[PDB]
Amino acid sequence: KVRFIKDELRLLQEPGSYVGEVIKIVSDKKVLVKVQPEGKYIVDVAKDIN
């Protein structure tokens, strides 16, 4: 029970997460992603997804 509440309070304390959608794949193993309320940001993929 202590670890569980501690885990949950931590999720809040992270800044936020957003939402986009992969528009294309580039050859440098990066992805162009359109972030839905803002603009598009092209960025190296995560270290646990490909």
Binding site: L11, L12, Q13, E14, P15, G16
Partner: peptide, 8 residues
């Protein structure tokens, strides 16, 4: 407010 998350 300081960081969005669902609380209520």
């Amino acid at each position: 407010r300081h960081s969005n998350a669902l609380v209520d």
